[PDB]
């Protein structure tokens, strides 16, 4: 789905590239023992097992259906690791990712995001397909396939009790509105329709526009957008870095919103926009903190 969503474009924008997206394994991949390796070494302290394969045999019967008592016993050892070895690092990583841009984050369990104090919209999604057989066909996922099945069961039971909506809602929200914009203003002039919003650091800051959202809409819509006051939306911007390797000279910035957030009905219902975007300043020297405000520039 990431590969498919990467190759999606309607107007002169990219909807969801292979960026602005954090993989579920990416939260715990950057540790000296990974979380997968950490939970691999769990047969120690459990009687009657001496290896990961022995643990998989002991916890899974011939039916490949989990034995309730044994898996419930094993969760009592799994949970302390997920509540002491993962949660602080996950919180730090999520906060860092939120600081340097607005990104869509994928996670395996609801409690994984909740216990890390994630600051964002929480969506629970399910797919029609059977995930267990997909795990059983996949290979080389750092350990045994039966280990993957048991670990998936552990994350499933770890999650809280709440009804997950279907993936169709999010996918339709992400894709469908843009096609109507292509139908309407695809024939229209590009520069006349194009518009964007971003932070505006004042010129008299010796050592700038950092886009926040981009709106593609008919000319009348953006003309209506112009006079709306993008004020009382302050943020502290820390922008110091070597150039991000890129098509244009562009350094990366870090903005944190202190006041409220942008209401979507304040933007429009007649105009589409982008859900995720990275932060980078449009232009060297050192960096500092500037209390900037929003601004709406167009052609």
């Amino acid at each position: 789905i990431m590969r498919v969503l990467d190759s999606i474009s309607v107007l002169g924008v990219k909807i969801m590239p292979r960026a602005h997206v954090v993989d579920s394994d990416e939260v715990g991949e950057q540790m000296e023992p990974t979380f997968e390796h950490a939970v691999m070494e769990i047969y120690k302290g459990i009687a009657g097992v001496d290896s990961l394969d022995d643990l998989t045999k002991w916890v899974l019967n011939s039916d490949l259906v989990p034995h309730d008592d044994r898996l419930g016993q094993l969760f009592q050892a799994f949970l302390p690791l997920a509540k002491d070895l993962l949660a602080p690092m996950a919180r730090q990583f999520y906060d860092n990712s939120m600081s340097e841009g607005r990104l869509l984050t994928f996670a395996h369990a609801d409690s994984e995001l909740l216990n890390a104090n994630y600051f964002g919209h929480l969506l629970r999604l399910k797919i029609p397909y059977i995930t267990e057989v997909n795990l059983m066909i996949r290979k080389n996922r750092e350990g045994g396939e039966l280990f993957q099945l048991v670990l998936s069961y552990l994350y499933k039971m770890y999650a809280t009790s709440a009804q997950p909506k279907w993936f169709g809602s999010l996918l339709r929200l992400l894709i469908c509105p843009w096609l109507h914009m292509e139908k309407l203003i695809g024939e229209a002039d590009p520069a006349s329709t194009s518009a964007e919003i971003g932070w505006h650091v004042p010129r008299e800051q010796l050592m700038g526009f950092i886009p926040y959202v981009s709106i593609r809409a008919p000319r009348l819509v953006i003309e209506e957008l112009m006079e709306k006051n993008w004020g009382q939306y302050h943020a502290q911007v820390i922008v110091t870095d070597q150039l991000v390797v890129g098509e244009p000279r562009r350094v990366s910035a870090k903005a944190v919103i202190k006041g409220n957030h942008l209401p979507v009905k304040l933007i429009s219902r007649f105009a589409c926009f982008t859900l995720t975007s990275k932060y980078e300043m449009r232009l060297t020297g050192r960096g500092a903190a500037y209390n900037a405000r929003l601004a709406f520039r167009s052609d």
């Binding site: 949970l79 509540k83 994630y118 499933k156 809280t160 009804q163 944190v256 209401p263």
Partner: protein, 1255 residues
């Protein structure tokens, strides 16, 4: 000796040596006012100390590192302190501060935080931000004292200059070592001397209104300002309680070790259970005697009916069978370098083998020796440490055990194997029994419950307006008027016309922060929810109230020791029936949406379904929401208003909470935080906490327990007790009672195994029970051993006061009120009565004068405030006790006690008048009282002690639309408005102004406006008006007293025979009271303690259980009783009750009932403004009011004390008139007989009626 030379007469006045007059008091007050701090320290240096007062001082308190190596900057541009010892090392470091000081002008030797670093932090430097955060945090730590400490030190010096005091009852001087044996005071002097050094100034720091100044010196650190207050507290407690020197020396050693450590607050938090765990938890390893109360509390349990039946001797087999507390105590003493103190305590504890007074006093001293200060830390750190923990659920509810979603709620099928089924069943039955039960639909009930949360206090209105404007809906604003714009009343006025659909967006708003410090405990953060967010959680708190009222055995007790369940602790601490203390650690983060809220919302949702269709609840219309309940088909399932409430609350609980933190101690530290902890400061928190505690304990005792146990004896024990019989829970804490069998007390091993089972059981759903099995009882911070209360002195500091923000302190009358509160707290804690009275008078004199001209309060005002007086008019010293009623009754009591000597004293010196007075005779009491300033003090004490910023000028029609908004908000249902209009109609028809100000629902908006305007800063003109009012009251001359006091003085009494004892004289009921403390011991032995909870007994007196906020039930009942006594037609009472909002039939029936019935003395007393003083509420006053005060004289009817059959309510007033005298005098409470009424019963009743026709 300079203290003697400058204070000679005053010590003799307040030590029972000579008479106590006003001129000496005023001269001493002036001398207190003009007394420099350096002079205080010189007088301190004049003290000729001795050995036994000297304890070595480590050299490492002064030499400390800097602050840079303790803080850092993390991601998101936030300032926080790096930790060196675990995750709790987030308190104030003990590092030096000298390099951050710039000298202040007008005095060279003092300085404050530099403005250069402040600006360099403001514009964005990192090190400057760290330095200013450290400086502000140290300022906040140093600013935790009521008043400049030198005033308290000087007051102690003046009070203790008197020496030993004679005891009228014991007929001997009190053997207490003088100031030469005061270790903490010597430590204070040594620390001040070492810090001051060559510099002429001697004060380490000076405490101003807003901010304090530091005396720069290389030996100055940040641990000094709490250490000084701690030592002064210890010295005052030693002087006023007779603490033995050894325990105080140990406490000072602990305090110095805490100061010398890395962090004072962190060390004192880590070592806060040294004394209570070595002494209270380890006595009576071997018993040989003593007496314990033989309490027995009746089978009616929800009413707390306790009975006392003598005292039984202690057998040898009633020793301490609890597991030994030696290993962990020794390990803790070894870890923190306190081995000597722990060893001394353990060795000293074992020497007490009899349950006499001495052991209880030793326990009291040990518990008092702990350090009581208000711990402080940066808000961004308490937020990050308290709101990030989450529960650990090891066996969660299986996913297959739920169903399709009813909107955002899934009902849990009763086929589940999880333990949540019983919780769901209990909450479901509670919700159903609520919904069927009919009082929840009368409009008055809805109005009351909607006005519960509308209070003149902040509720995060800025977030509300931001969220509500995010949807382009505009709310009115009010400008130019002086009301506060950051209170929930403002929000209620703003949310009047708006419907629920528009305001439903604000439910998901981000709550603002709150904070308040606490003694020897980490500070608690509080999140106030906006008005609709309080509104949406009404069914939750209501069904929790139902659970706590009917299903379980629990209490919702009050704040003070007087309004608490003391008997239950006395019963649970008796040796035959040992008890278990159960506490839940971090209950705020305990309940989340995974288990508890998930079960509870569904239980409430389908609890009300089949009982209330339609019939919208308060301000929440009914609505429609689909469900996918059964297999594939989905219905529309119309829901009531309460269920829409539940849906909104369920989305709020499922998503979580957003918590804005914008502190002031750290610049550039504003951010937001998402947390899953249940909100504190909401309406429903404590009720649901207690309900869940009771339900989980019950299900453990029933189903989970026996399913996970093997031994037969533990099973026999577990099948025997249930929460309805022996379990009492209030919020976080709880207490369980194990009753004794025929063969003594239950075996300890079974209890230990059961506690292990409880610990195992609690971790399944994310709870960590903090269980202590020590043979004692703890509940609501009350300590009992062997049926004897123990007041924790250190938990009530004398100089401490919590302050979260950096706001300036209130003016001088506020500190007067605070001193009076300190005296009352000392009264409740049982100090040495003579010494405590003397020290209270010393503080009284010290804080009695303030300049602007100068203003002074004559002593008599302070006497009217309730402080007893020692020796006046040449009477016997130490003749009045502090059970004196405060207020008018109190003046009457002592004046009538000492009247025949007052007249003689007046006549003996130049006060003679030919006119004869029925009260004082031929003595010119008018001129004498005017000269003595007694009238001036009596009248000035009644003036308000806060600026009259209420009533400030406001532009018109703006206040009018404001009041209209509150009126519309209060009364949305037309029928209630119709009731109020009717009540006014028949009130105009019948009331005819018989009572001047009848309470009504239309005046609630006015009271709310006044209260909302009150919570604001007062301009200089308001303070000027207040001082002018005090000056005018002082300068004026008054002809006579108030009408009530003159009416009281017409009554004469006689005291023949003392009561027979009600408690055995060898039974220790409470610490601090013993033969060494004659007055409280004799008072309690003669009268007796109250064996019934005061809350229910006071509740049964009221006619109406509760009323709308902004009105007083006491006021309503007083108006009703005035309209009975002053003759009025029944219709007047019906109109009044209609104006309160009661329905016409019920109002008529209640008025008819009230017309003819008689009521107990308390309610009748309220008719003339009399209530039981808060001091008496610790004793059994009801029996004295009923039996031991007899209106019939001891020699039959006198034809003068003839109460008419009309105005029969006079008996209650006479009962308090007698009881005040019976309780004021020292020694044994004495039976008191009515003697004479001057003008006659009918004349006195006419005087009371002509006063009632006022106000």
């Amino acid at each position: 000796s300079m203290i003697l030379t400058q204070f000679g007469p005053f010590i003799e006045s307040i030590s029972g040596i000579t008479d106590q007059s006003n001129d000496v008091f005023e001269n001493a007050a002036k001398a207190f006012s003009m007394f420099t701090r350096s002079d205080v320290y010189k007088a301190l240096d004049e003290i000729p100390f001795s050995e036994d007062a000297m304890l070595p001082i480590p050299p490492t308190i002064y030499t400390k590192p800097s602050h840079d190596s303790y803080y850092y900057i993390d991601a998101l541009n936030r300032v926080r302190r790096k930790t060196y010892q675990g995750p709790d090392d987030v308190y104030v470091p003990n590092c030096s501060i000298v390099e951050l000081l710039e000298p202040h002008e007008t005095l060279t030797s003092y300085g404050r935080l530099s403005e250069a670093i402040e600006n360099r932090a403001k514009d964005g430097d990192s090190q400057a931000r760290i330095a200013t955060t450290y400086g502000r945090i140290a300022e906040s730590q140093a600013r935790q004292i009521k008043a400049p400490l030198e005033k308290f030190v000087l007051a102690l010096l003046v009070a203790e200059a008197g020496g030993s005091l004679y005891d009228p009852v014991l007929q001997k001087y009190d053997e207490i070592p003088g100031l030469s044996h005061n270790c903490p005071l010597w430590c204070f002097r040594e620390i001040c001397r070492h810090i001051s050094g060559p510099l002429p100034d001697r004060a380490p720091y000076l405490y101003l209104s807003a901010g304090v100044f530091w005396l720069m010196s290389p030996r100055m650190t940040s641990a000094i300002p709490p250490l000084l207050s701690d030592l002064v507290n210890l010295a005052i407690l030693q002087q006023t309680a007779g603490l033995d020197p050894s325990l105080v020396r140990l406490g000072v050693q602990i305090c110095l070790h805490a100061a010398a450590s890395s962090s004072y607050a962190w060390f004192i938090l880590k070592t806060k259970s040294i004394f209570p765990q070595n002494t209270l938890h380890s006595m009576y390893e071997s018993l040989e005697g003593g007496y314990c109360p033989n309490l027995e509390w009746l089978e009616p349990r929800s009413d707390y009916k306790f009975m006392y039946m003598g005292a039984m001797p202690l057998s040898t087999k009633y020793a301490r069978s609890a597991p030994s507390n030696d290993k962990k105590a020794r390990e803790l003493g070894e870890k923190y370098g306190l081995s000597s103190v722990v060893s001394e305590l353990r060795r000293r504890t074992k020497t007490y083998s009899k349950h006499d007074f001495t052991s209880v006093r030793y326990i009291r001293d040990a518990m008092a020796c702990t350090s009581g200060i208000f711990l402080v830390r940066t808000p961004t750190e308490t937020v990050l440490q308290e709101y990030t923990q989450s529960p650990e659920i090891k066996v969660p509810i299986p996913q297959k055990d739920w169903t399709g979603p009813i909107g955002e709620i899934r009902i849990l099928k009763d086929t589940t194997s999880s333990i949540a089924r019983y919780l769901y069943r209990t909450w479901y039955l509670a919700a159903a029994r609520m919904a069927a039960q009919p009082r929840t639909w009368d409009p008055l009930f809805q109005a009351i419950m909607r006005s519960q949360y509308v209070t003149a206090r902040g509720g995060s209105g800025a977030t509300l307006r931001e969220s509500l404007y995010a949807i382009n809906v505009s709310l009115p604003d009010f400008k130019g008027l002086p009301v506060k714009a950051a209170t929930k009343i403002f929000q209620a006025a703003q949310l009047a016309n708006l419907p629920f659909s528009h305001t439903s967006v604000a439910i998901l708003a981000d709550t603002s922060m709150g904070l308040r410090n606490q003694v020897q405990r980490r500070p608690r953060s509080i999140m106030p929810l906006n008005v609709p967010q309080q509104q949406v959680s009404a069914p939750h708190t209501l069904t929790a109230d139902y659970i706590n009222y009917h299903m379980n055995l629990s209490t919702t007790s009050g704040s003070a020791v007087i309004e608490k369940v003391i008997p239950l602790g006395v019963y649970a601490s008796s040796p035959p029936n040992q008890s278990i203390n159960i506490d839940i650690s971090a209950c705020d983060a305990s309940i989340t949406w995974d288990f508890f809220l998930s079960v509870i919302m569904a239980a409430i949702h389908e609890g009300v379904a089949s009982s209330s269709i339609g019939k919208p609840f308060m301000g929440v219309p009914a609505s429609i929401v689909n469900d996918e309940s059964v297999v594939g088909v989905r219905a529309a399932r119309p829901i009531s208003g309460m269920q829409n409430m539940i849906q909104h609350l369920s989305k709020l609980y499922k998503r979580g909470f957003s918590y804005r933190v914008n502190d002031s101690f750290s610049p550039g530290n504003d951010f937001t935080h998402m947390t899953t902890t249940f909100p504190s400061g909401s309406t429903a928190t404590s009720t649901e906490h207690t309900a869940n505690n009771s339900t989980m304990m019950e299900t453990f005792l029933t189903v989970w327990g026996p399913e996970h146990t093997d031994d037969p004896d533990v099973l026999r024990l577990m099948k025997s007790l249930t929460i309805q019989r022996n379990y009492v829970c209030q919020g976080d804490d709880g207490l369980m009672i194990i009753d004794g069998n025929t063969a003594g007390k239950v075996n300890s091993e079974t209890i230990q195994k059961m506690l292990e089972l409880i610990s195992k059981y609690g971790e399944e759903f994310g709870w960590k029970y903090d269980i202590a099995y020590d043979g004692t009882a703890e509940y609501l911070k009350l300590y009992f051993i062997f049926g004897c209360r123990i007041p924790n002195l250190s938990r009530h500091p004398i100089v401490g006061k919590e302050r979260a923000n950096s706001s300036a302190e209130e003016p001088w009358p506020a500190i007067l009120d605070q001193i009076m509160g300190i005296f009352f707290n000392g009264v409740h804690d049982g100090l040495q009565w003579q010494r405590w009275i003397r020290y209270s008078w010393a503080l009284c004199c010290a804080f009695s004068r303030q300049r602007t001209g100068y203003l002074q309060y004559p002593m008599w005002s302070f006497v009217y405030w309730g402080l007893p007086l020692v020796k006046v008019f040449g009477s016997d010293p130490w003749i009045f006790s502090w059970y004196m009623p405060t207020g008018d009754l109190g003046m009457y009591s002592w004046i009538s006690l000492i009247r025949p000597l007052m007249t003689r004293w007046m006549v003996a010196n130049g006060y003679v008048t030919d006119k004869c007075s029925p009260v004082f005779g031929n003595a010119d009491y008018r001129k004498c009282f005017n000269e003595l300033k007694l009238y001036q003090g009596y009248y000035m004490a009644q003036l308000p002690r806060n600026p009259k910023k209420s009533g400030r000028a406001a532009p018109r029609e703006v206040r009018e639309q404001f009041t209209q908004a509150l009126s519309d908000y209060l009364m949305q249902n037309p029928e209630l408005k119709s009731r109020v209009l009717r009540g006014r109609s028949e009130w105009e028809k019948y009331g005819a102004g018989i009572i001047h100000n009848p309470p009504s629902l239309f005046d609630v908006p006015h009271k709310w406006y006044q209260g909302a305007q009150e919570a604001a800063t007062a301009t200089r003109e308001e303070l000027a008006e207040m001082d002018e009012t005090l000056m005018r009251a002082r300068k004026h001359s008054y002809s006579s007293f108030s009408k009530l006091l003159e009416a009281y003085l017409l009554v004469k009494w006689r005291m023949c025979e003392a009561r027979e004892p009600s408690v055995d004289l060898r039974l220790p009921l409470c610490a601090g009271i013993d033969p060494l403390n004659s007055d409280p011991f004799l008072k309690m032995v003669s009268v007796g303690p109250m064996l019934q909870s005061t809350r229910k007994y006071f509740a049964q007196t009221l006619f109406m259980a509760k009323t709308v906020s902004g009105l007083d039930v006491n006021a309503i009942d007083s108006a009703l009783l005035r309209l009975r006594t002053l003759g009025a037609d029944k219709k007047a009472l019906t109109a009044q009750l209609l104006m309160v909002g009661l329905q016409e039939s019920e109002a008529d029936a209640l008025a008819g009932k009230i017309m003819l019935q008689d009521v107990n003395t308390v309610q009748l007393a309220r008719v003339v403004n009399l209530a039981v003083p808060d001091t008496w509420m610790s004793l059994d006053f009801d029996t004295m009011f009923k039996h031991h005060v007899k209106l019939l004289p001891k020699d039959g009817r006198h034809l003068n004390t003839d109460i008419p059959p009309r105005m029969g309510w006079l008996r209650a007033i006479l009962r308090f008139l007698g009881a005040g005298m019976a309780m004021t005098a020292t020694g044994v409470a004495v039976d008191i007989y009515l003697e004479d009424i001057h003008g006659g019963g009918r004349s006195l009743g006419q005087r009371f009626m002509t006063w009632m026709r006022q106000e």
